[PDB]
């Protein structure tokens, strides 16, 4: 019954232009997800032709 982390705001989305990122403080876990239809390490290109 617990839930409280930190959602990476757009002001800190420099490591992912078109992608999201969840940073867990209590559990040092800086995870960074990106739009499935995205390309590039920093998420700068896009390929969602689908």
Curated annotation (Swiss-Prot):
Protein's name according to its UniProt entry: Betacellulin
Residues of the full protein shown: 62 to 111 of 178
Stretches assigned to the EGF-like domain: 4-44
UniProt source species: Homo sapiens
Superkingdom of origin: Eukaryota
Localization per Swiss-Prot or TrEMBL: Secreted, Extracellular space
Disulfide bonds: 8-21, 16-32, 34-43
């Amino acid at each position: 019954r617990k839930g409280h982390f930190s959602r990476c705001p757009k002001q800190y989305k420099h490591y992912c232009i078109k992608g999201r990122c969840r940073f867990v403080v209590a559990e040092q876990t800086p995870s960074c997800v990106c739009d499935e239809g995205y390309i590039g390490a920093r998420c700068e290109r896009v390929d969602l032709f689908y």
